[PDB]
Design a protein around this motif. Structure first.
Motif, PDB file in Angstrom:
ATOM      1  N   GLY A  29       0.830  -1.122  -0.034  1.00  0.00           N
ATOM      2  CA  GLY A  29       0.018   0.026  -0.003  1.00  0.00           C
ATOM      3  C   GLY A  29       0.822   1.217  -0.051  1.00  0.00           C
ATOM      4  N   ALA A  31       2.516   4.997  -1.206  1.00  0.00           N
ATOM      5  CA  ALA A  31       1.991   6.181  -1.753  1.00  0.00           C
ATOM      6  C   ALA A  31       2.106   6.368  -3.451  1.00  0.00           C
ATOM      7  CB  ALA A  31       2.497   7.296  -1.203  1.00  0.00           C
ATOM      8  N   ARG A 131       5.031  12.645   2.079  1.00  0.00           N
ATOM      9  CA  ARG A 131       3.743  11.854   2.108  1.00  0.00           C
ATOM     10  C   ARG A 131       3.980  10.383   1.629  1.00  0.00           C
ATOM     11  N   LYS A 133       2.900   6.288   2.760  1.00  0.00           N
ATOM     12  CA  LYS A 133       1.945   5.040   3.227  1.00  0.00           C
ATOM     13  C   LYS A 133       2.295   3.843   3.237  1.00  0.00           C
ATOM     14  CE  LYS A 133      -1.502   6.932   0.430  1.00  0.00           C
ATOM     15  NZ  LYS A 133      -2.699   6.986  -0.375  1.00  0.00           N
ATOM     16  N   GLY A 134       1.835   2.821   4.191  1.00  0.00           N
ATOM     17  CA  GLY A 134       1.952   1.446   4.029  1.00  0.00           C
ATOM     18  C   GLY A 134       3.037   1.022   4.815  1.00  0.00           C
ATOM     19  N   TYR A 135       3.609  -0.324   4.208  1.00  0.00           N
ATOM     20  CA  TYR A 135       4.433  -0.938   5.230  1.00  0.00           C
ATOM     21  C   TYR A 135       5.519  -1.553   4.264  1.00  0.00           C
ATOM     22  CZ  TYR A 135       0.833  -1.148   8.782  1.00  0.00           C
ATOM     23  OH  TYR A 135      -0.252  -0.783   9.789  1.00  0.00           O
TER      24      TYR A 135
END
Ligand code: CA
Ligand code: CA
Length: 144
Positions: A29, A31, A131, A133-135
């Protein structure tokens, strides 16, 4: 070429050194053409070395499934993972970082097959501008 698997980092074995197997499994997930730069460092002396994964073209869930071996002082050295989006004609955009110690970690059993397990690490910003997101999905173990 005659070397299938290189060891990076410390260039010879000492009493206080171990080889860590770092599996960079996947980004989840994010960016978009991601790679991971994996930097081995020592708090007191800074960067020893870094290795970059292959780049996965056009994916927000890249499956690098790549292994990198580092020779390390496990109680002293750390790893910084930084994910980037490779841009052909400009600066690569930053997609986040993970910073981890190298002790304690499990030691592989040479007699048994390496089981598939992993941990997910939340990706962190590197400035107020990031900015992210996620892992990042990773597995780290010592060689026997
Ligand atoms: Ca790109
Ligand atoms: Ca670029």
């Amino acid at each position: 070429a005659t070397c299938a698997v290189e060891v990076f980092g410390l260039l010879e074995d000492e009493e206080n050194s171990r080889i860590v197997r770092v599996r960079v499994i996947a980004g989840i997930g994010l960016a978009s053409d991601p790679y991971v730069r994996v930097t081995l460092y020592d708090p007191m002396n800074g960067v020893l070395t870094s290795v970059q994964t292959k780049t996965i073209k056009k994916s927000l869930n890249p499956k690098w499934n790549e292994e990198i071996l580092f020779r390390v002082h496990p109680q002293q050295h750390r790893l910084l993972f930084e994910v980037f989006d490779e841009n052909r004609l400009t600066r690569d955009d930053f997609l986040g970082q993970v910073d981890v110690p190298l002790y304690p970690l499990p030691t592989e059993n040479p007699r048994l097959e390496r089981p598939y397990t992993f941990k997910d690490f939340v990706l962190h910003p590197r400035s107020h501008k990031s900015r992210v997101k996620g892992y990042l999905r990773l597995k780290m173990t010592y060689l026997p």
